[PDB]
Point group: none
Chain length 237, copies 4
């Protein structure tokens, strides 16, 4: 079991090393983390060997001057063959509508596009970093569960600061109300505050609802964005 660990926050993020350490209990771990979200193809990318931190076990590692997906492409090359791609633990949530724009998810998705199993890991912050020592038991429990899954898999994981359980969830998909509030800076110049708000509370069974309940959320994701119910649409006239 060879595991490539990457993230979106960069090579110095405490979240990256917490995931690398948790993952090492399940196989050999290699790290490639960044110094857009797609693989850079128009030109060469720089990547250099990087010494893992003093207060973490040792892990072979590279700092990549590219995107999280670039880290996956490079990692599969330098440390091949790789069986699993783990991305995170991101300092900040990746829930509901957020999954679309997540670099952390983008790395995991890239691993899956290459035919490997993958999972993204994130922790909701709201002004307060996480305690990775306390989350460790939960990181391990989550990884254990993921490894029993039929492969390949693609899962998006969100762990609350202090977990009280685990739940497989679906993505929260809420409609939003547009809220724009005009304002002016200290210089009298105008600007606009954007504060779009969801129309309802997160529904039970969703990732958003689960973390709010103190549960680790695991959402299996698909790659296909096709709305399969509208391929032969009824047209008015």
């Amino acid at each position: 079991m060879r595991i490539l660990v990457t993230n979106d926050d960069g090579i110095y993020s405490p979240g990256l090393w917490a995931l690398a350490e948790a993952a090492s209990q399940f196989g050999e771990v290699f790290v490639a983390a960044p110094d857009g979200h797609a693989i850079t193809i128009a030109h060469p990318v720089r990547a250099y060997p990087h010494p893992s931190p003093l207060h973490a076990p040792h892990f072979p590692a590279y700092r990549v001057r590219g995107t999280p997906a670039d880290c996956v492409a490079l990692g599969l090359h330098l440390f091949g063959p790789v069986d699993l791609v783990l991305s995170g633990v991101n300092l900040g949530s990746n829930l509901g509508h957020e999954i679309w724009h997540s670099g952390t998810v983008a790395a995991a998705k890239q691993g899956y596009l290459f035919g490997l199993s993958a999972a993204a890991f994130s922790v909701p912050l709201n002004g307060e970093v996480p305690d990775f020592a306390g989350l460790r038991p939960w990181l391990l429990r989550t990884l254990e569960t993921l490894l029993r899954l039929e492969r390949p898999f693609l899962v998006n994981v969100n762990l609350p600061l202090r977990p009280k359980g685990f739940l497989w969830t679906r993505q929260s998909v809420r409609a939003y109300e547009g809220v724009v509030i005009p304002g002016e800076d200290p210089m009298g110049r105008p600007f606009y505050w954007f504060a779009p708000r969801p129309l309802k509370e997160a529904e039970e069974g969703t990732d958003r609802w689960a973390v709010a309940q103190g549960f680790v959320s695991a959402t299996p994701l698909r790659l296909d964005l096709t709305d399969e119910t509208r391929l032969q649409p009824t047209l008015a006239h």
Copy 2:
């Protein structure tokens, strides 16, 4: 009908005005385009901008999603959000990281109908005058759909037809080619390639055949075949 037109290439792209003009044949058009989620951490600046026909327009120092939120405030009420015409394809796996699509998706999240428009490139620059008839046809077709809708459109340089399509979803094999710059420093080229030919009925397949591709999109990324009960 009131239509907000935006894009990802910015206020100076000819594709934007081509889209704005085509849309004007179906309703009142307003433009808000960048100078991918909605900016909330800080406020956004936006300025009136002249169109190169005339359209009320703003240049926004934010993301395409920002342009949609701002356009709604500046030009509300709005019924339809159109994004593009992007110079470059937004096919298959590209849909995920597309700013053009992100704007259309934002409009849909606000309860409106939306569509993204892109034209695959390389070597040849789009002739929007030639594309106009196909743009109008596509728009006319989209406006016959049950609402609301969210569709991703890719038009080839010179279309010969229109097809509804599903997104191309292919596996890739990694390709990494180590190298050195003229100063002997190391670097890596990435050239991952698709494992097979695009499937029939997919967006990538359709454009390759010279047809306009229109893929309806789903917001929910949940894979229900892998949902699970609790073990309590």
Copy 3:
């Protein structure tokens, strides 16, 4: 003495905490590092941050802004501050590099506010700094700076394994433009830029000193005016 410590690499950089710890040996340290001018346009966010596990406790904030922003915000949240220390940066800040250095800009901003300040950097050249080994030298350097008349503005570059300390002047070499063409996968062209210095660094300059293995300390001016060209 109250000391504000910041940097350009961010709140998670090991060089940041190495500087804070070394500084704590001379006064009470407060930290504000980014998550180069002061952001006057829009509002900036800042959050209380916990000091690293294996490091002394330091009141600290993670700032969603520039190094100069950290200085401005820091003087507000921890005022009064006597000294601003920026670094230790991972990468050199020698000669022509000083002008556009973010680490240096934080220090300059402190000076602009009427305080003493110093920037600390360690040229890497492919390796990584060992802050445990550099501590004695960081301390010796701080000790020497605190003997200066206040306020002062000094740029410090510490080689990985220092064998001495020297006051230096900034190296100012002329460069030669080296451009080598190449092509992307579509055969489209691009160019590699590799400008190179024309001569060796002059003795006594910051570049020269680090190449000798010495810690370089360059006092900086704020005035870019070339007085010899006025009149």
Copy 4:
């Protein structure tokens, strides 16, 4: 004389073409403008850029890099070059702003390569600059610059409607910190920074000069060493 003209605002700035046209009265002009340090991480892309129907033609490239990259590439594609002109920037570059100016960085890069160079900027103050009105002043300034001993490095700020020309020194004022808290409509806290200078700009400085209506030209030094402190009293 061959002249490389670049800027920080980009290939479509009217300020760029005004400078290029003024420079053409003095020698052959070539343009390389962005699409502050030289990029060495990856290679930089550049593409031939066309001249408009109603404009004199200048060989030019749009460069996907920094203003400094434009200078290096420009020296390669159009070399040999004798002078590097950067601007005209839409917005001032006075006093403390000089350190963060991309317009100035390009001129400085030219100087680092052994050439003469000058940066040009116009403070906006809520107006759109009139380059037909500024042209005479651009020409007078170039005339002054071109008789200087070479190489030179000068930072020029032209007021919207100049009435004179002054050699100035950079304004260097101390500041007082001003931080004013606030919170977004969602109740989240944030901070506004509004540091302010302790005094009015001194006579003879670039800021004073422009406030008075004069074109300001400041010769710049590369050496940031404060030599009055090379052997301090500890």
